[PDB]
C-alpha cells in the first residue's frame, strides 16, 4: 500500500547534495528577491516584502482560493510576509500575527508597508499553547520538513489538530507539510466534510517539499490532488533540468491605511449611460461580482472574455544572433520580463493604481489655482486653442494601426463619432471608455478621436515647445535634450534636481484636474462646449475596462474613478507637462521662502505675494527647468529647494525611491543628470568640435532591440535593421552598438526598408527609418540642423564620428575589454553569415569598418 508520495520521499533522500540542489528548483516558479534583500539589508521599511511568503500567499489570493477579509489571524507569522500582504486587501480590517520567536525561529520584521497600522505581529506566542479566537480569516504556514515521513506525518496532524478549532465558516489557507501519508489523507477527508475547502499545490514551492495548502474556496478530490503532485514531483527527478521561471516580487507600498477613506463614490448621472451600453452589448455574460478586489475604484459589473496577454515578451532572433555576449546578461533578460496576462494586470492595478491621494490643504489649493491661471495665460500669449479635425486625425493614423487605417476610411466609423459628439454637446457620454468586435473598436477609436478633436491642439500645435512654454521640450528631439540641459547648467544657483514622482498619473488630484480644465476659458464657444464634455464627462469621470482572472475563467471588469489621470486618454502628455511645470514652480516658491508651512495650512491665503513672485520671477524660474510630462530637471536659485518638500508632498507628488521627508539629492555635473531615461555626454570630435550626445545603460539598449513586435523573418530582420540605424544615429558613440549596428546592416538585405518603430517616445523623430546612407543623415542631424554646431563643415568619414572615452563607455555598460566581447568581435563575419543563411539568397552589403 506504498503511496507515490512515499516513493518520491525515498528517491529524494537518496539524492547527493549536487543532484538535490539541481532538482529542488527544476521547473519551479520563483520571485526575484535581489532588490528586497538589499533593501532590507539597508533597513528600508517601505515597498519590500519581508520574505518570499508575501508572493507565496499572493498566488492563492489572486486565484480566489482564499480571500482574506475582516479580522485575519496569521498563525506562525514568522517575519510577517503573509500579514503585510493581507494588510492591503479590500475587505481586511485587522491582521493579528502570532509567532514563537526566540532562538532558531523567525522573528517579526517591523515594516511601514501599506496598512502597517492594522498589522499586530506578536512574538513569544507559540500557537500550540494558544486558545482559539474568533476570526474571519485563518492563515497558517507552519510545518518543518524531516527526512522521516512519519515525523512529518506527526507534525502535520499536530498542525491540523491545532488549527481546526479556529475554523468556523471563515476563510482559510493552511499549509499541509506532508499530505501524502494515508493517516493525513484520512484526517483531511474528515476535515473537508466539516469545513469544506480543497488541497492545492503552489508552484512557488520547491520540488524538495511535497507541501500542499488546504484553502477554503473550492472543492475536489484530496486523494487525486495529492497523487497528481506526487506524479509531477516524480517526473521532475528524470526531466531535463529546467531553470526556474522568474517573476517580479511584490510591491507592498507605503504608509497608513484608512479603510473608510478608500471607497469611490461614483457619479451615476454622468457614467450611468456608458455602463448601460456595455451591459447591453455583453448582456449574455453580464454579472455583478461581489468578490471583486477594487478598493478605491467603483465597481459596476463584469462580463466573460478569453484571456489576452503573455508572461514574457517575444525575442528578435536576428538581433539575438548578432549579440551573443548579452545572452548571459541579467539586465538584458530582465528587459523581456513583462507580464501582460490578467494575473500581471491585476498585480500592477493593486500595487500602483488602486490608491487614493489625500486632498491637498486649502493654502496648497490656493497656490496651485493662482499658479495654474498664470501658467495658462503665459502659454496662450501667442497661440489660441483650436479644434482638430477628421482630416487631421486620419492623416496621423495613416502616417504612423492596420485596423485604425481601415476604421478612419470607413464612413460608418465617422457616423458613430458624430452621434457621440451630439451627446457630448448635450452634456452626455454614451460610449467613451478606456482600457487599463469592430463596434467595441470603433467606440474606442471614436473616443480617442473626440479627445483629439478637443485637446489635440496641445500637442499638434506644440504648446509645450521650449519657445512657447520656457520649461517644455516638446518637439525638440532626444538629440537636443542634452544641449538644453547643458544650457540650463550655465544658469547660476543650486544643483540640478531630477526627482521622479512615484506613479505620477495616479497622483493627479481633483484639484489638478480642475486647474487643467481652465484652458477652456481661452477657447471659442463651440470648442469650449466639446472640451468641457471631454474634461467633465470623461477625464473627471473615467469608465475603464480591466481583465481579471477568476477560478472559472477570465472576466472584463467595468470600474470607474473621478481623480487620477486617464493614462490611456489623449491629452496626457500636455496635461502632465502643465501640472508638473505648476508643481515645480510651487516647489521653487517654497525653496525661496515665498511659500511657508503656515501659508499651506491657511484657508484664506492671500494672493498678492504669489502673484508678485509669478509676475516678476515666473518666466525666469520656468527657464531653469526642462519638463517633459512627469519628468523634470530643475536648477533652483540655491539649494534650499532640496529641503522644500511640504508643498510637493501635500500636492500628492510624492517622490519615488526616497523617504517622504528625506531632502533631495541633486547634481552639479549636468552630464550625470537623468532625464527621459537618458543622460548626456559632451564629446570632442577628432576635428576639435564639441558634440553633446544621448546615452543610457547599454543593457537597456540591447535588451530593447532583442524584443520583437507583432513568423515573419522579414519583419523581424527589418525591425533589427531599424534598431541598427537608430544606434548609428543616436548611440554611435557606444563601441559595442556601432559594431552591432554595422553587423545588423551587413546581415539584412540592403534594399529592405526598416519597418515598425523602435520607440513610441514623443522625443523620437525616427530619422533612421530610411534607406538613405546613414552618414548623410548623421551629418544632417548633428551638423546641418544642429543649432549648437556653428561650424557647418560635414564629416566625410565615420572615423571622425566620435566614441565616448573607453572608461565612460565601460561605466555605461560597454563590454569592451572583456574576453567574451573580443570573441564576439572576432566572430562577427560568421554571425552575419548565419543570419544571411537564415534569410536566404538576397542582396547584402558589408558595413563592417
Ligand atoms: C523613455 O524611453 C525612451 C526615451 C527616448 O528618448 C527620450 C527614446 C528615444 C530613442 C531615440 C530617440 C531619438 C531621437 C531623435 O529624433 S528618442 C526611447 C525610449 C524608449 O525606451 N522607447 S521604448 O522602447 O518604446 C519604451 C518602453 C517602456 C517605456 C516607454 O516610455 C516612453 C517607451
Ligand atoms: N509553535 C509555533 N508557534 C508559532 N510559530 C511557530 C511555531 N513553530 C514554528 N513557528 C514559526 O512558523 C513559521 C513558518 S514560515 C513563516 C513564513 C511566513 N508565512 C512569511 O510569509 O514570512 C516560522 O517562522 C517558525 O518560526
Ligand atoms: Mg526624472
Ligand atoms: Zn463620450
Ligand atoms: Zn553614458
Residue numbers in the entry: 6 to 405, 418 to 453, 470 to 743, 746 to 884
Please give me the paper's original passages concerning this structure.
DENV NS5 is a large protein of 900 amino acids composed of two domains with key enzymatic activities for viral RNA replication in the host cell and constitutes a prime target for the design of anti-viral inhibitors. A guanylyltransferase activity was also proposed for the N-terminal domain of NS5. Its C-terminal RdRp domain (residues 267–900) synthesizes the viral genomic RNA. DENV RdRp possesses a right hand-like architecture conserved across different polymerase families, with three subdomains termed ‘‘fingers”, ‘‘palm” and ‘‘thumb”. We performed a fragment-based screening by X-ray crystallography targeting the DENV NS5 polymerase and identified an allosteric binding pocket at the base of the thumb subdomain close to the enzyme active site.
